[PDB]
Write a protein that binds this DNA or RNA. Structure first.
Length: 50
RNA sequence: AGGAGGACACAAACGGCGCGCG
């Protein structure tokens, strides 16, 4: 349950690849790649180009 | 003779590593 909630606060994060720890719910909530700064504050918009 | 009867709808995703540009 600890690994499911806030993976990384444990002694060591679990992984299923070359030592790439699995992202948890708390990992998805916060962070520069998290929802707050990735999809809510700044979001990709249609009707645009470059 | 007479007479009688007789299927609609429906268009490609997510995480690393590297490089590069503003």
């Amino acid at each position: 349950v600890d690994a499911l909630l806030d993976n990384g606060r444990r002694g060591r994060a679990i992984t299923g690849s070359n030592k790439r720890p699995l992202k948890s719910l708390a990992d998805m909530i916060k962070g520069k790649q998290g929802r707050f700064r990735q999809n809510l504050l700044g979001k990709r918009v249609d009707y645009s180009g470059r």
